[PDB]
Amino acid sequence: EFVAMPVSTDLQYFRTACNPRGRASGMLYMGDRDADIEAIMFDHTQSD
Amino acid sequence: MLHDNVTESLRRITASGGRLNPTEPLPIFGGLRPATSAGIARGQASVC
Amino acid sequence: TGFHPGIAFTVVRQDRFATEQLLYAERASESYFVGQIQVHHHDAIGGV
Amino acid sequence: ELAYVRDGVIQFEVQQPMIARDGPHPVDQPVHNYMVKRIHKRSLSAAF
Amino acid sequence: TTQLIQQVSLTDFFRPDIEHAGSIVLILRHPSDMIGEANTLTQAGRDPDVLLEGLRNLFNACTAPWTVGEGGGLRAYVTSLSFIAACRAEEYTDKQAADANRTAIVSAYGCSRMETRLIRFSECLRAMVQCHVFPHRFISFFGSLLEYTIQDNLCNITAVAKGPQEAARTDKTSTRRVTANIPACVFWDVDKDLHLSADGLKHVFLVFVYTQRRQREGVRLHLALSQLNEQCFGRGIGFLLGRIRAENAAWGTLPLVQLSNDPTSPRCSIGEITGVNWNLARQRLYQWTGDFRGLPTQLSCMYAAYTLIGTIPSESVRYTRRMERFGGYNVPTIWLEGVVWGGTNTWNECY
Amino acid sequence: MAMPFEIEVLLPGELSPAETSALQKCEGKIITFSTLRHRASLVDIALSSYYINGAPPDTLSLLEAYRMRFAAVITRVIPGKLLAHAIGVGTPTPGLFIQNTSPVDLCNGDYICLLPPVFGSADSIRLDSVGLEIVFPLTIPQTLMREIIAKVVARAVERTAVICYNGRRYELETNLQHRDGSDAAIRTLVLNLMFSINEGCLLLLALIPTLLVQGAHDGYVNLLIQTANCVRETGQLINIPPMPRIQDGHRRFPIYETISSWISTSSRLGDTLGTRAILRVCVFDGPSTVHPGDRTAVIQV
């Protein structure tokens, strides 16, 4: 499967483990027990 | 600074290039603080 | 914009590692006195 | 009891040998050291 | 040791056998006093007959609507926090925690004339803000629910008005003891929103929030925990309610030093004052028109009120959230452990 | 809870005998804790906890702290720890006592408010072992707290732009080390001064020429008119035409509004520009008055 992306997305992101969405996600990074779970995956105002 | 517009300009520009900034309207009980991120990945962010 | 204004910086940051200590204590290195156990009660959620 | 103690101390004394030396050198004498310590106070606590 | 109050009342806004023992219950002032206070306190330019109309409309859809005037002794004295929380169940932020309470309270009281008695209560509370006799003058804190006994439409209520909640023996059932209890819609701890500490004694407040906007205003009821004493809880909630304070401020409605410092300015004496003169008073001295009209007032800009009802003297305060059977349905509740009820229900208003 | 809320401040066991003999004498003095725990440490009441941005506070920020913070009373100092009683949460506190820390005497019955040290220098403790200076709030009667709070907020306004008692004068040493608390107080003064004016105030404003004649016909009014540095000047220099007809005047009453919504903003002016009253002296069988330094028997409000 192919995912479109700019031609300038630097390579050092692909020289290790990574995510095709280009942004980490998931329950593992919750930090707190009440943190917004779908604000890690989508909310693009907070840094990755 | 002498003018109160250059100060807001500087404080917005410096916030455009980092994530530690105090992005809140001045709270009365705490002094100043950064916003709580939704997640955390690699440990405690060491301030340079 | 990417212009070098003739000045340089020396970045400083401090990191904190978790170690595993190794202690050696000679025989009779401490003289350890003990007292007497006293007790005082105190009111609570409705009991003692 | 140990609870009425203000400051219980410990004393010390050590004698040191010497060496004779035909001149020219500073002729020496025997020396004695008198040293005193003092204890610290701590506590413990549990509850139910 | 504790204290207990006992009050026999009707069974309209409080059915003390679906209510979990340990919930808080509220007292209601005689409704005939609103029709006296409205005449004086309503704002010049509004018909005070709206509150009278709504109040008459409410008790018609109630129990036996007689002796609801003055000489009537036996009436509906008490109401539960759940009832007021379920009539304004659209103004609470947590929609899921509130609509369930409303559904359970409508389908649990075993009545079809309910849900027509809840719409009337909310209209009455909304009118009371529009006529400037706020609900914080006609409701207060009756004790926690401890023990009851009921008959045909007649209920007898026991409470606990002072002392520790858990040092109270209910001989009926289930460990002979009773714990505090509120529905999760009304609960919010300000020390978390203000980002404050945790370890320490906390107080328990009762907060009314007022919005001043004609024909679409609103009011809700809250129960808050905070590490701030009563003198500084206003500065607390005054910060988390900016958009209501400001909108109420603006959507609900003399150079003496100079002339007194000019030793050549026209000035009369103490022995010259005969104000009956149409010249000496009006024309000679500096004329000025007052026009203190339509200006922001106290009763208009008031956006909230609160009173201290108890305290939690623990090190760290601990509360849960367990969905309990509220008579057929399940509602998100919150159990407060170790509450010692204070008193002297003195309300502090915000501005 | 049925017992009085006890606090246990743990003293460091490495002090000097004089450094703890001074603490032995501070029984009956008032201290304040940010949070109300059962096991506090000596770092929670020293001058380190009254820090705003890493600096010693002024007489205006300390004033805000004294009403923001919980209060307690030191009752006895044993060699190990320090035992204290909480004041304003749990009523049970029988036989509570309080040492008069003030220059002026305390008479029976007065309410007690607590001031940061303004009369000269403070009588404090300098525990140089761990490096903590502990200051204790004063104990001033409520009928005298309100004079000094006024004399200091007036000076705050004057910046941004002596006291007699029982026939004895004193001088203030109140200082303003910055400019934020001054305005945090000025805004409250002006706000509370701004929520008093209403429609019915004009009918009170038309009585100034009549109060000026009743000050010449009577004796008690002639003293009230001297201090009124405005009513005494307007009553001979300004005029007002009759008021307009009251909107819905058949129904409402404006003066009742303007003097009902006036007591509120005056039962708060003291408790916001200053501190509330927490205790009041009730000496059942002890001496009547109290000189500086003698323990009293109080009962919490």
**C31 interaction partners in chain D (CB closer than 8 Å):** 10, 39
- Min Cα distance B1 → chain A (Å) is 29
Chain A meets chain C (3+ C-beta pairs below 8 A): no
Dist CA F282 CA F109 (whole Å): 6
Helix (H) / strand (E) element for E210: namely strand E202-211
Q: Of the candidates D29, D8, D27, which has an alpha carbon nearest to the alpha carbon of residue D17?
A: D29
B16-20 — which CB contacts under 8 Å span 24+ positions? B19/A47, B20/B47
Give the Å distances, CA to CA, from E55 to E38, E177, F74: 12, 39, 55
**E164 interaction partners in chain C (CB closer than 8 Å):** 45-46
Identify whether the C-beta of residue F3 lies closer than 8 Å to the C-beta of residue F34: no
Give the Å distances, CA to CA, from F166 to E264, F66, F102, F144: 42, 26, 14, 11
Give residues with Cβ within 8 angstroms of E262, minimum separation 6.
Answer: none
**F205 interaction partners in chain E (CB closer than 8 Å):** 290
Within chain C, what is the greatest distance between any pair of CA atoms? 73
Tell if the CB–CB gap between C36 and D1 is shorter than 8 Å: yes
Q: Which residues of F26-50 are buried (b: 16+ CB within 10 A; e: fewer)?
A: bbbbbbbbbbbbeebebebbbeeeb
Q: Which residues, listed in sequence order, are joined to residue E311 by a DSSP beta bridge?
A: E203, E340
Residue of chain B whose Cα is closest to the Cα of A38: B38
Residue of chain F whose Cα is closest to the Cα of D42: F13
Contact partners for chain E, using 3 or more CB pairs closer than 8 A, are B, C, F
Q: Determine phi and psi for F276, rounding to 5 degrees.
A: -75, 175
Dist CA E165 CA E142 (whole Å): 14
Q: Which residues, listed in sequence order, are joined to residue E26 by a DSSP beta bridge?
A: E79, E141
Resolution of this structure in Å:
4.4
Dist CA E14 CA E79 (whole Å): 5
Identify whether the C-beta of residue E16 lies closer than 8 Å to the C-beta of residue E170: no
Dist CA E111 CA E327 (whole Å): 13
- Min Cα distance A18 → chain B (Å) is 13
Q: Number of C-alpha atoms within 13 angstroms, CB side, residue E343? A: 12
Q: What sign does the CA torsion over C21, C26, C31, C37 have?
A: positive
Dist CA F72 CA F63 (whole Å): 16
Give residues with Cβ within 8 angstroms of E283, minimum separation 6.
Answer: none
**B38 interaction partners in chain A (CB closer than 8 Å):** 31, 35-36, 39-40, 43, 46
**D10 interaction partners in chain C (CB closer than 8 Å):** 31
| F20 three-state secondary structure | helix
- Min Cα distance C42 → chain D (Å) is 11
Q: Virtual CA dihedral for E93, E96, E98, E103, nearest 10 degrees? A: 150
Instruction: Closest CB to C35: pick one of D1, D8, D39.
Output: D1
- Strands F70-77 and F97-99 come out as unpaired
Tell if the CB–CB gap between F198 and E44 is shorter than 8 Å: no
- Min Cα distance D40 → chain F (Å) is 7
Instruction: Closest CB to A36: pick one of B19, B38, B41.
Output: B38
* Per-position DSSP letters for F109-132, written without gaps between them: T-EEE---S-SSS---EEETTTTE
Q: Of the candidates F291, F288, F281, F287, which has an alpha carbon nearest to the alpha carbon of residue F105?
A: F291
Helix (H) / strand (E) element for F134: namely strand F132-134
**B39 interaction partners in chain A (CB closer than 8 Å):** 24, 29-31, 35, 40
Dist CA F237 CA E286 (whole Å): 7
Peptide bond into D24 cis (omega under 30): yes
Q: Of the candidates F105, F31, F38, which has an alpha carbon nearest to the alpha carbon of residue F73?
A: F31
Single-letter code of the amino acid located at E115: E
Give residues with Cβ within 8 angstroms of C44, minimum separation 6.
Answer: E338
Mutation site, C33, C34, C38, interface D, largest D CB count within 10 A: C33
Dist CA A30 CA F245 (whole Å): 66
Written as six digits, the tokens of F32 are 């304040």
Dist CA E194 CA B28 (whole Å): 9
- Strands E286-287 and F238-239 come out as parallel
Dist CA E55 CA E49 (whole Å): 10
Dist CA E185 CA E98 (whole Å): 5
Dist CA F229 CA F179 (whole Å): 28
Write down the residue that tokens 């204790």 correspond to: F136
Q: What is the CA radius of gyration of chain A?
A: 13
Dist CA F26 CA F235 (whole Å): 55
- Min Cα distance C6 → chain D (Å) is 58
Indicate which technique resolved this structure: cryo-EM
Residue of chain C whose Cα is closest to the Cα of E2: C46
Give the Å distances, CA to CA, from F71 to F1, F49, F157, F300: 18, 14, 29, 11
Give residues with Cβ within 8 angstroms of E264, minimum separation 6.
Answer: none
Give residues with Cβ within 8 angstroms of E142, minimum separation 6.
Answer: E5, E7, E24, E25, E26, E27, E78, E157, E159, E161
Written as six digits, the tokens of E174 are 């289930």
Whether chain B has a CB inside 8 Å of the CB on C16: the answer is yes
Residue of chain F whose Cα is closest to the Cα of C46: F1
Single-letter code of the amino acid located at E100: A
Strand residue runs (E) in E212-266: 218-226
Identify whether the C-beta of residue F96 lies closer than 8 Å to the C-beta of residue F299: yes
Q: Of the candidates E134, E225, D6, E227, which has an alpha carbon nearest to the alpha carbon of residue F17?
A: D6
Identify whether the C-beta of residue E141 lies closer than 8 Å to the C-beta of residue E221: no
Dist CA E254 CA E178 (whole Å): 64
Write down the residue that tokens 């002024």 correspond to: F58
Tell if the CB–CB gap between C35 and D39 is shorter than 8 Å: no
Dist CA F29 CA F73 (whole Å): 6
**D40 interaction partners in chain F (CB closer than 8 Å):** 13-14
- Min Cα distance D32 → chain F (Å) is 29
**Residue F280 burial (CB < 10 Å; 0-12/13-18/19+)?**
middle
Mutation site, F91, F237, F243, interface E, largest E CB count within 10 A: F237
Dist CA E342 CA F4 (whole Å): 15
**D6 interaction partners in chain F (CB closer than 8 Å):** 17, 79
Using the 8-state DSSP alphabet, how is residue E174 labeled?
A: G
Q: What is the Cα E57 distance to its own chain's centre?
A: 21
Chain A meets chain F (3+ C-beta pairs below 8 A): no
Give the Å distances, CA to CA, from F167 to F104, F105, F109: 11, 12, 20
| E237 three-state secondary structure | helix
Q: Of the candidates F85, F271, F36, which has an alpha carbon nearest to the alpha carbon of residue E203?
A: F36
Using the 8-state DSSP alphabet, how is residue F41 labeled?
A: B
Write down the residue that tokens 């009120």 correspond to: E305
Give residues with Cβ within 8 angstroms of B28, minimum separation 6.
Answer: E235, E239
Q: Which residues, listed in sequence order, are joined to residue F106 by a DSSP beta bridge?
A: F290
Helix (H) / strand (E) element for D16: namely strand D9-16
Angle between helical axes of F220-227 and F208-217 (0-180°, round to 10): 130
The number of helix segments (H) and strand segments (E) in chain D equals: 0, 2
Tell if the CB–CB gap between E195 and B28 is shorter than 8 Å: no
For residue B28, the tally of other CB atoms under 10 A from its CB is 12
Dist CA F296 CA F110 (whole Å): 12
Sheet holding E323-325, edge to edge: E182-183, E330-334, E323-325
- Min Cα distance F93 → chain D (Å) is 25
For residue F55, the tally of other CB atoms under 10 A from its CB is 10
**Residue A25 burial (CB < 10 Å; 0-12/13-18/19+)?**
middle
Single-letter code of the amino acid located at E190: V
Q: Of the candidates F9, D7, F78, F14, which has an alpha carbon nearest to the alpha carbon of residue C33?
A: D7
Using the 8-state DSSP alphabet, how is residue F230 labeled?
A: T
Single-letter code of the amino acid located at F122: A
For residue E51, the tally of other CB atoms under 10 A from its CB is 24
End-to-end Cα, chain B, rounded Å: 25
Angle between helical axes of E95-108 and E118-130 (0-180°, round to 10): 120
Single-letter code of the amino acid located at E143: G
Dist CA F248 CA F60 (whole Å): 46
Dist CA B15 CA B12 (whole Å): 5
**B19 interaction partners in chain A (CB closer than 8 Å):** 47
